[PDB]
């Protein structure tokens, strides 16, 4: 069982000594972030470890990161770490490899332009108003408020309407078929027993694929495949009600070099957009409101900036959202402290030599975002929430390969601008109406989960008083 | 279990209807050759079938075959069908894929030039003399002679001396450690229960690789890895006795673009050369002596040609072997009737469109050599042994993509000239001394095995009388 455990020694690369069969997974007992921080302060700029038999090489040099993420992306570092069983979701752009990905990224790029986003802003803002009416019902009743519930329902409303044109107040329709299914698309905890078992027994993945066992649950995928079918037909009939959702943008793409999106590929992308945006958006928004509640000074200044740009609670628009600097600064600093990706990864497909370091075929090159976002070498007082880092005066010292909450290069986050616009639109409408103060039962300082997802240990609960 | 069984229907390609899970493997009850002949006369120029879930596309068009074997070899049809578990023998040139193969083929090409073969001919001829002394011991005693025994011992003697410099009369040293180990390298019967099981459960191959279970038996591979080690050291010490074996040619290659052969790669090639030459050479030589014994006219003419070129039983040399035309004609016609490969195969690595036919990614493109060698469209009276086909007058009508006993293109047989020279050298020395006549217990007509290897059903036994 000590087959490949000798790689990093032959190359002279340091790291924690692995155990037979297990590799270094027992060190994940405090999550990915704490393991990366510990390895960083312990072994320096580069180190190696083993997820079972799989070797992983961590890199922290911003010149080296640029070579992996940008310069040699097509040639060597094109794909992410394999995982499964994935079934047909192999066709999702985030999972596809080599030429299949390059084609899918080429097909989906016009869907995420600033023009299509501009046409989605009125839809997103509608549920910012819905978010305020539900927040006010929990504010006129003096009761502590679980953020991820009210931000989860907001993210759900934005997803259903901007990806399928389905318009629901999901907080008050918890058993609409579209809401209960979409709510089941929970992010993967790679440290739970099932995924840790697969990590230790990767040879069992082909056995699960032949039995049609899938990490994306069949019941939800079957419901969306048929729902897309019914919408693709009905949209052909009533063809006067113009739509501006991802489904409609992808339906149109099939009406043109590359092959057009197949009907199954189209479903795969629609599903992966939900996974990408649903718990991510609500998690970040909760992190933001925590930092705003623990720093009343920052919250007031943002509320003053919003009222200067949008007097009299004027509705946020596309151009006015991008106008607010302190809002962008608050969002960025919160993502520095809580980069929910935790890591960026690329599989080394060829025996390569970059920046003087030899990297052999099969190694997973990893960029530890959570650690680099808190590295004293680039951030003074990294544990403190200080949005002034991202002011126009100081944003020249921020290295774009140390700060990668959306990745970088050709395979970065394709929904970055959408996610930023979505979160800011929510933040503006919420702060125009409310202020957020800690409870007695608020966890200060916030503690992170020991699991495989960057989320609070306990839910963030805050008191919400109206600005009336 | 009927997952991929719908491919050839969507493409409109005919073939036998597959069963769930099994595919079409139950049709292998008469071997590969009879299944290919039956499918050819039944479905035409192109057909498809399933080895379990694996789709296989058979092609018979010589223009299409050239595109697969030659024109699009590097781009699309580079590798052979995956099989396992293979362990470290993944590094053998016949098993390696993509850039690994292209490098290994580049490293091994100078080893198989006509110059290195010219320097090996004296060694090979030595055991042609040994073959005659052992044949005569079985001829002065009137007793029927099993060909594959006396040709197996000859092929063994040629292999040990031309690949390792180990010089043994293996027929009379059956328990030299080098002889009993090398004799265990038996060709793979892909129709025996184990390989048929792997075909039906290909998802179990990763489970066997993690347990170091290997189709190349460990005991023999361990013996040769250490034997090569001891020879690589001892050859460095006594460095005046010049050697002309494959091991010495590959030892020298490590003393130079590409990376040099590693010590493990070098062992992998040495092993695969034995698999390639051991039972193949003795099988063909047996087939040749059968056709010569069933056609006394052809045998006398060849004996007269040999005596005209080499009067007084003169020893065959490099230039005199290539001089004999009827010898080349006899060898070729026997390989037409018995192309021990049976099939050539290439995996389709990309969605391609060649000669008007669309071929999708993952399909195994197969060229049925045994069937094309007996196709009435190109061979008049194909079931009859008629060496005049390969005379200089008639060799203009022979299509090099219908007649492929050594394959074709960049990935053809690299030891073709060696194998032809080895077999002819044996044939000359044998026919200079003996004549071969059928027994009562000789199977006339010869019947083929129902297994996965092109070999006689019963051993070819012939009477051997001396030409004294
Ligand atoms: C706060 C919200 C989000 C964050 C922090 C985030 C972050 C990230 C990160 C770090 C990556 C990997 C980048 C890399 O490997 O270099 C990624 C990939 C991706 N994201 Fe986002 N994301 C968010 C929301 C979204 C949304 C709303 C979408 C909507 C479509 C989306 C679509 C994608 C896709 C498709 C990929 C894979 C791109 C590819 O493989 O080519 N993400 N995201
Ligand atoms: C009567 C004897 C032999 C016959 C009929 C024969 C036939 C063949 C055939 C049909 C192929 C596949 C060609 C293709 O896929 O297009 C092949 C491949 C090969 N043969 Fe031979 N062979 C013989 C003996 C030998 C010998 C003595 C060697 C000694 C080294 C050898 C070395 C190889 C190798 C290395 C390959 C794989 C080439 C590659 O994958 O690049 N063979 N042979
Ligand atoms: C720890 N880990 C990951 O973090 C991971 C993964 N596949 C994708 N990711 C992100 N696998 C298999 C894994 O073991
Ligand atoms: C955390 N995580 C992953 O790490 C992941 C994923 N899909 C693929 N991967 C690798 N999803 C949906 C996810 O939530
Ligand atoms: C616990 N668990 C999972 O977490 C899981 C799964 N299939 C996919 N996932 C993610 N199965 C079968 C499972 O038992
Ligand atoms: C948590 N979980 C899953 O997430 C899961 C599953 N089977 C499939 N999936 C996706 N099982 C049994 C499960 O317990
Ligand atoms: C880190 N990460 C990814 O790696 C990712 C993604 N969507 C697709 N991928 C691959 N999202 C939302 C994400 O946060
Ligand atoms: C939240 N999230 C995702 O949603 C995700 C992912 N990889 C793929 N996806 C979709 N990773 C690493 C992730 O953290
Ligand atoms: C029938 N068959 C072959 O003929 C074969 C093979 N791998 C190589 N060959 C030649 N496999 C897996 C196979 O099933
Ligand atoms: C018949 N046969 C094969 O079909 C084969 C092989 N090695 C690999 N393959 C595919 N050997 C040694 C073999 O004898
Ligand atoms: C019958 N048989 C084989 O034929 C075989 C094998 N491993 C490799 N081969 C070829 N095992 C384990 C086996 O039982
Ligand atoms: C015939 N055979 C093999 O050829 C073999 C094996 N184990 C490994 N090999 C290669 N066993 C058990 C076996 O019966
Ligand atoms: C058909 N065939 C092959 O396919 C082959 C081989 N040696 C290597 N390969 C791949 N030999 C001797 C062979 O006869
Ligand atoms: C005899 N033989 C081999 O020796 C061989 C092979 N494929 C690889 N090898 C080595 N095939 C198909 C084969 O028939």
CSV table of N, CA and C and ligand atoms in Angstrom, one decimal, chain A residues 80-81 83 94-95 186-190 216 272 275-276 342 452-453, ligand 4:
chain,number,residue,atom,x,y,z
A,80,UNK,N,-9.4,19.5,-13.8
A,80,UNK,CA,-9.4,19.4,-12.3
A,80,UNK,C,-9.2,18.0,-11.9
A,81,UNK,N,-9.1,17.8,-10.6
A,81,UNK,CA,-8.9,16.5,-10.1
A,81,UNK,C,-10.1,15.6,-10.4
A,83,UNK,N,-13.0,12.9,-9.9
A,83,UNK,CA,-13.8,12.4,-8.8
A,83,UNK,C,-15.1,11.8,-9.4
A,94,UNK,N,-17.7,22.1,-15.7
A,94,UNK,CA,-16.8,22.1,-14.6
A,94,UNK,C,-16.1,20.7,-14.4
A,95,UNK,N,-16.7,19.7,-15.0
A,95,UNK,CA,-16.2,18.3,-14.9
A,95,UNK,C,-15.5,17.9,-16.2
A,186,UNK,N,-27.2,19.8,-2.7
A,186,UNK,CA,-26.3,20.2,-1.6
A,186,UNK,C,-24.8,20.0,-2.1
A,187,UNK,N,-24.0,21.0,-1.7
A,187,UNK,CA,-22.6,20.9,-2.1
A,187,UNK,C,-21.9,19.6,-1.4
A,188,UNK,N,-20.8,19.2,-2.1
A,188,UNK,CA,-20.2,17.9,-1.7
A,188,UNK,C,-19.2,18.2,-0.5
A,189,UNK,N,-19.3,17.4,0.5
A,189,UNK,CA,-18.4,17.4,1.7
A,189,UNK,C,-17.4,16.3,1.4
A,190,UNK,N,-16.2,16.7,0.8
A,190,UNK,CA,-15.2,15.6,0.5
A,190,UNK,C,-14.6,15.0,1.7
A,216,UNK,N,-24.5,13.0,-7.9
A,216,UNK,CA,-25.7,13.9,-8.2
A,216,UNK,C,-26.9,13.0,-8.1
A,272,UNK,N,-25.3,22.3,-13.2
A,272,UNK,CA,-24.0,22.7,-12.5
A,272,UNK,C,-24.1,24.2,-12.2
A,275,UNK,N,-25.6,24.2,-8.7
A,275,UNK,CA,-24.5,23.8,-7.7
A,275,UNK,C,-23.6,24.9,-7.5
A,276,UNK,N,-23.3,25.7,-8.5
A,276,UNK,CA,-22.2,26.7,-8.4
A,276,UNK,C,-22.8,27.9,-7.7
A,342,UNK,N,-11.7,27.4,-1.0
A,342,UNK,CA,-10.6,26.9,-0.2
A,342,UNK,C,-9.4,26.6,-1.1
A,452,UNK,N,-15.4,19.5,5.3
A,452,UNK,CA,-14.8,19.8,4.0
A,452,UNK,C,-15.4,21.0,3.3
A,453,UNK,N,-16.2,21.8,3.9
A,453,UNK,CA,-16.8,23.0,3.3
A,453,UNK,C,-16.5,24.2,4.2
C,4,LIG,C1,-17.6,21.1,-2.8
C,4,LIG,N1,-17.9,20.6,-4.1
C,4,LIG,C2,-16.9,20.0,-4.9
C,4,LIG,O1,-15.7,20.0,-4.4
C,4,LIG,C3,-17.3,19.6,-6.2
C,4,LIG,C4,-18.6,19.7,-6.6
C,4,LIG,N2,-18.8,19.2,-7.8
C,4,LIG,C5,-17.6,18.7,-8.2
C,4,LIG,N3,-16.7,18.9,-7.2
C,4,LIG,C6,-15.3,18.6,-7.3
C,4,LIG,N4,-19.6,20.2,-5.8
C,4,LIG,C7,-21.0,20.4,-6.2
C,4,LIG,C8,-19.2,20.7,-4.5
C,4,LIG,O2,-20.1,21.2,-3.8
